[PDB]
């Protein structure tokens, strides 16, 4: 496929460029540290906050349509399904609430720094902290939405066969939803010690 | 060195544009998927046509969230502004756009199924509406974060 | 750093061209899908062709949105201009352009399905028009954002 050809082309040119700079004695030109040390920390922080809710919403939306389409299909000959199985949608939607909540907390950190302190130790720490803290919450919520959704669709299909089965399968959705809390807890921990931009 | 470099407006301009672009793609997909569903089922059941357009108007709603954020962000653009104001309104653009995009896809997929099922199990309609609205808010949660960030965009900024 | 570097017009030219390019791809796809549907069904029912042609007209309008934004941007190009004007009218170009592409895909699919089905269920035609209007305004939202940005491109600018 054509996209794989692009990947190998990009890999090869990167290797050649690195080897070229190395042999000519300019290996220190490609200085990842100075890039990381000199870009504005407002980029990392705002990019983290955006992707946090953004990816969380993608997870919830993906979970809902996995569950909803099967629930509607199962309901055609068993309309009793529609009202009791709503809980599976609830477990998907709450994953978006956690994304919103973290956005509330992090937004308070976005004070504006004076120019003399822009790239100081404390401000840089907050910039990196918010970025990765946002990613873990967003990525964990994205994964969580899929797992709950796939289980929710499975529950609706099973419930239509015998009402006694739903209660037993529902247990698996609880285990799936816990991944939302753990993502939230780690997000708050790694961000909790950072200070607002001084 | 300086807080207000010449390229700072770039993030504002692309933030303003991406807010409507991604939201528009989401609403288009939501309209397309459900639209075929309506046309498919109404051939035999024309009487319930106007009951079944709900997924289309709900998809239409998402586009309006993109518009208002784009308008609210746009009024903040200026030639001289800090990187602080640049990135914070890029975050507003990304968050609403990426949220509305996801909400549009979900409304399309579940609305397609709901419209077909509703044609032969009439109790199933209320089930559809309940699920769709929980998809709609996924756009709204994007709007709220965009509003929060935008409320802060020019507060106390030195430049 | 200069407010008005020599490469500033570049983003203007890209914005000017991008406005009409993407909008034409949207209108082209909407015309193609609708055209196949019309030709496929009107063989048996030729009497209703001039009623079923509306989706082609609806897709055709989207190209006009791109044209006017492209022309309005074009007449603001100059050799010496602030970089801020370049980014703003790049954003004006993208917002209408890729909104037109999104609306084009929507009109193409529901236009085909609606025409295909309407030929054996006369009550469905009003439904097709009603859905197409929701698809149409997705382009209009892009135009409104583009014109707002464009109006802001040259006021209170120093160079």
């Amino acid at each position, epitope marked *: 496929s054509f996209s794989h050809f692009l990947y190998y082309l990009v890999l090869i040119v990167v290797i050649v460029y690195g080897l070229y700079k190395l042999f000519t004695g300019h290996g220190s030109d490609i200085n990842f540290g100075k890039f990381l040390l000199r870009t504005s920390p407002y980029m990392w922080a705002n990019l983290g906050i955006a992707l946090c809710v953004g990816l969380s919403v993608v997870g919830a939306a993906w979970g809902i349509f996995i569950t909803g389409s099967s629930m509607i299909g199962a309901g055609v000959r068993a309309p009793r399904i529609t009202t009791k199985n709503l809980i599976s949608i609830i477990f998907c939607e709450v994953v978006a609430i956690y994304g919103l909540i973290i956005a509330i907390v992090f937004s308070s950190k976005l004070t504006v720094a004076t120019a003399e302190n822009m790239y100081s130790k404390s401000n840089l720490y907050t910039g990196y902290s918010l970025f990765w803290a946002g990613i873990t919450v967003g990525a964990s919520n994205l994964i969580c939405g899929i797992a709950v959704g796939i289980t929710g669709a499975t529950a609706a299909i099973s419930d239509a066969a015998d009402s006694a089965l739903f209660v037993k399968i529902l247990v698996i959705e609880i285990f799936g939803s816990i991944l939302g809390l753990l993502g939230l807890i780690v997000g708050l921990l790694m961000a909790g010690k950072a200070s607002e931009f001084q | 060195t*300086e807080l207000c470099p010449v390229y700072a407006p770039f993030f504002g301009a692309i933030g303003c544009a991406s807010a409507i672009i991604f939201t528009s793609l989401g609403a288009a997909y939501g309209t397309a998927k459900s639209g075929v569903g309506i046309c498919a089922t109404c051939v035999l059941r024309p009487d319930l046509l106007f009951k079944n357009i709900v997924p289309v108007i709900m998809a239409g709603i998402i586009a309006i969230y993109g518009l208002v954020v784009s308008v609210l962000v746009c009024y903040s653009l200026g030639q001289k502004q800090a990187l602080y104001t640049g990135f914070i309104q890029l975050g507003a653009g990304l968050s609403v756009g990426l949220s509305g995009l996801a909400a549009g896809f979900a409304i399309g997929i579940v609305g397609d199924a709901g419209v077909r099922g509703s044609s032969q199990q009439p109790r199933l309609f209320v089930g559809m509406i309940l699920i769709l609205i929980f998809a709609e808010v996924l756009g709204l949660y994007g709007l709220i974060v965009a509003l929060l960030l935008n409320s802060r965009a020019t507060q106390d900024v030195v430049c | *750093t200069e*407010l008005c570097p020599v490469y500033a017009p570049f983003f203007g030219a890209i914005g000017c061209a991008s406005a009409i390019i993407f909008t034409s791809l949207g209108a082209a796809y909407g015309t193609a899908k609708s055209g196949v549907g019309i030709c496929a069904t009107c063989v048996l029912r030729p009497d209703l062709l001039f009623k079923n042609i509306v989706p082609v007209i609806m897709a055709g309008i989207i190209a006009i949105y791109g044209l006017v934004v492209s022309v309005l941007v074009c007449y603001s190009l100059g050799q010496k201009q602030a970089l801020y004007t370049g980014f703003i009218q790049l954003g004006a170009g993208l917002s209408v352009g890729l909104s037109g592409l999104a609306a084009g895909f929507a009109i193409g699919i529901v236009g085909d399905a609606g025409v295909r089905g309407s030929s054996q269920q006369p009550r469905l035609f009003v439904g097709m028009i009603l859905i197409l209007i929701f698809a149409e305004v997705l382009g209009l939202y892009g135009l409104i954002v583009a014109l707002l940005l464009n109006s802001r491109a040259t006021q209170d600018v120093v160079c």
Partner: nanobody
Amino acid sequence: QVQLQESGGGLVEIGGSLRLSCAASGTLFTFNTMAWYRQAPGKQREFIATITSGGNTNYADSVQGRFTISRGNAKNTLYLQMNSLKPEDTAVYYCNARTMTGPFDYWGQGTQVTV
């Protein structure tokens, strides 16, 4: 468009105290630097005082300990106060507001004071 206005000018008794007030409008950001200048007839403009957004103050030697400059509660508002005045202080006085880089450097219309 940005604009500025002085106020508080006019004639005053010898040795009297006086205050000048200034404001700037039409921009969303706080100005990095704001300052006062003066001009007597037959002379070029003379520096008087300046204050940063962080509240740091600097003065001309001639008015050291006689004049005081401060910012107001709200953004982009400025004050000058002189505890006593003498004939060599008579002039028109101007506000100035500046940006850390670029051509964005604004000046007011000015107001007169005499003994």
